[PDB]
């Protein structure tokens, strides 16, 4: 029917949901920013829900991004967490879907598989649920039904959830590919693609899954679908990702934005192989309570040997190469030993200290690894063990450390010069 007319209100559900800076824009014909939500026609359903959420004026990122998405322009937005990114894309997306109906395709075949009108990819369960929870608020009294799926949980409840109707899907890339392989999700009619915290999604190694979802299946190509990318940082790989995924897009800088995470203190120490375990014990002994430590080693056998060592020294630790992660979630075993390939696509959360026991051969991988720590709330630590085996990344590491404005070892530079 008409999706602009609000359904009758449920006050039980109303209680459940609603009871709780410089910006530069670059691109062609960028729509003017708004000062007020009413400065754009977002319809009765959205405006009603905005009042219930007790939001008055739009945040800086919302002031610029909303009229941009409203005009169906692709968006590359560089903004930090807590900016109000979620409502910045949810509000105008849901608005359009209220104005436009479900579409000719959905209306022509309404009679397992669900075809979401909008897809929102997120790196973690935490962020996905936050986006979903706000999607519920703004979809209140509407015919749009948001669903959320993520890894590290029973896929059965999620599948049964999808079957009950899904127009907007919030998903972690890994679980989504699982849903597509099971024929439970089709992307044929996905007109709104949002990638939230894309730099973190690449840090966790979701890029093949992301390119599998966007470029290798049935999702409409750029210029047909409308795509929005949100990233706190703008490194090379994000730039290339935006070039691939976005079409004639506006770039948004909602403040200071660079190539590096900003919230990671990087320490590079020279440690010979035979001293690494002793140096590691010293680090662990200086590790406070409450703190979760992540330790990267290069090979699988290395992880095995290191884990055995730590247990024999009486350290509460677990390894990855299930969920050795409730053991890590909780802090039963606050030390996680892992290879990069095995931590890939896994939601390793609240790591305060990352230790590169072994360094990788590619500087890109180093950035992904240290990205496992650091949030706007608290500064994260990345300690890396370096020796003659890592000489061939000297120049690239040095270059990263200066760009990240980190302390540079007085010897690191001298060995690069060779």
From Swiss-Prot:
Record key words, sorted: Acetylation, Apoptosis, ATP-binding, Cell membrane, Cell projection, Chromosome partition, Cytoplasm, Cytoskeleton, Disease variant, DNA-binding, Helicase, Host-virus interaction, Hydrolase, Immunity, Inflammasome, Innate immunity, Intellectual disability, Isopeptide bond, Membrane, Methylation, Nucleotide-binding, Nucleus, Phosphoprotein, Ribosome biogenesis, RNA-binding, Transcription, Transcription regulation, Translation regulation, Ubl conjugation
Modification sites for Phosphothreonine: 287, 318, 383
Effect of residue 375 to H: In MRXSSB; loss-of-function mutation affecting regulation of Wnt signaling
Ranges for domain Helicase C-terminal: 263-416
Subcellular location field: Cell membrane; Nucleus; Cytoplasm; Cytoplasm, Stress granule
A GO term from the CC aspect: cytoplasm
Effect of residue 38 to A: Greatly impairs phosphorylation by TBK1 and fails to synergize with TBK1 in IFN-beta induction
Molecular-function GO terms, alphabetical: ATP binding; ATP hydrolysis activity; cadherin binding; CTPase activity; DNA binding; DNA helicase activity; eukaryotic initiation factor 4E binding; gamma-tubulin binding
UniProt modification remark: Phosphorylated by TBK1; the phosphorylation is required for the synergistic induction of IFNB mediated by TBK1 and DDX3X. The cytoplasmic form is highly phosphorylated in the G1/S phase of the cell cycle and much less at G2/M. Phosphorylation by CSNK1E may inhibit RNA-stimulated ATPase activity.
Catalytic activity: ATP + H2O = ADP + phosphate + H(+)
Motif Q motif, residue range(s) on this chain: 35-63
Domain Helicase ATP-binding: start-end pairs: 66-252
Keyword NADP: no
Effect of residue 287 to A: Impairs phosphorylation by TBK1 and fails to synergize with TBK1 in IFN-beta induction
Residue location of crosslink Glycyl lysine isopeptide (Lys-Gly) (interchain with G-Cter in SUMO2): 70
Result of altering residue 369 to H: In medulloblastoma; somatic mutation; loss of ATPase activity; interacts with CSNK1E, even in the presence of dsRNA; contrary to wild-type protein, strongly interacts with CSNK1A1 and CSNK1D in vivo; strongly increased ability to activate CSNK1E kinase activity, leading to increased DVL phosphorylation, thereby activating Wnt/beta-catenin signaling; no effect on RNA-binding, nor on subcellular location
Mutagenesis or variant effect for residue 69 to T: In MRXSSB; loss-of-function mutation affecting regulation of Wnt signaling
Similarity remark: Belongs to the DEAD box helicase family. DDX3/DED1 subfamily.
Subunit structure of this chain's protein: Homodimer; can bind RNA as a monomer and as a dimer/oligomer. Interacts with TDRD3. Directly interacts with XPO1/CRM1. The interaction with XPO1/CMR1 is dependent on the DDX3X nuclear export signal motif and XPO1 interaction with GTPase RAN in its active GTP-bound form. Weakly interacts with TBKBP1/SINTBAD. Directly interacts with TRAF3; this interaction stimulates TRAF3 'Lys-63' ubiquitination.
Protein name as catalogued: ATP-dependent RNA helicase DDX3X
Protein's organism: Homo sapiens
């Amino acid at each position: 029917d008409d999706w602009s007319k609000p359904l009758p209100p449920s006050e039980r559900l109303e209680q459940e949901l609603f009871s709780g800076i410089p910006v530069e824009a670059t691109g062609n014909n960028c729509p003017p920013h708004i000062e007020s939500f009413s400065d754009v026609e977002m319809g009765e359903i959205i405006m009603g829900n905005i009042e219930l959420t007790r939001y008055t004026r739009p945040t800086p990122v919302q002031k610029h991004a909303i009229p941009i998405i409203k005009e169906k322009r692709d968006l590359m937005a560089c903004a930090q967490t807590g900016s109000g990114k979620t409502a910045a894309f949810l509000l105008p997306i849901l608005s359009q879907i209220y104005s436009d109906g479900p579409g000719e395709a959905l209306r022509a075949m309404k009679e397992r598989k669900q075809y979401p009108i909008s897809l929102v990819l997120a790196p973690t369960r935490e962020l996905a649920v936050q986006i979903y929870e706000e999607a519920r608020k703004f979809s209140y009294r509407s015919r749009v039904r948001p669903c959320v799926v993520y890894g590290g949980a029973d896929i059965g409840q999620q599948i049964r959830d999808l079957e009950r109707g899904c127009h907007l899907l919030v998903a972690t890339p890994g679980r989504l590919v699982d849903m597509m392989e099971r024929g439970k999700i089709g992307l044929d009619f996905c007109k709104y693609l949002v990638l939230d915290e894309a730099d973190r999604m690449l840090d966790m190694g979701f890029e093949p899954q992301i390119r599998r979802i966007v470029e290798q299946d049935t999702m409409p190509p750029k210029g047909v679908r409308h795509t929005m990318m949100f990233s706190a940082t703008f490194p090379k790989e994000i730039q290339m990702l935006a070039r691939d995924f976005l079409d004639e897009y506006i770039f948004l800088a909602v403040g200071r934005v660079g190539s590096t995470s900003e919230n990671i203190t990087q320490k590079v120490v020279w440690v010979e192989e035979s001293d690494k375990r002793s140096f590691l014990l010293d680090l662990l002994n200086a590790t406070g309570k409450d703190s979760l430590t992540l330790v990267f080693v290069e090979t699988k056998k290395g992880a095995d040997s290191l884990e055995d060592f730590l247990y024999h020294e009486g350290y509460a630790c677990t390894s990855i190469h299930e969920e050795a992660l409730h053991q890590f979630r909780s802090g039963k075993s606050p030390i996680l030993v892992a290879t990069a390939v095995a931590a890939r696509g896994l939601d390793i959360s609240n790591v305060k200290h990352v230790i590169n026991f072994d360094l990788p051969s590619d500087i890109e991988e180093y950035v992904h690894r240290i990205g496992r720590t650091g949030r706007v709330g608290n500064l994260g630590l990345a300690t890396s063990f370096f020796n003659e085996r890592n000489i061939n990344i000297t120049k690239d590491l040095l270059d990263l450390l200066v760009e990240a404005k980190q302390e540079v070892p007085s010897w690191l530079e001298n060995m690069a010069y060779e």
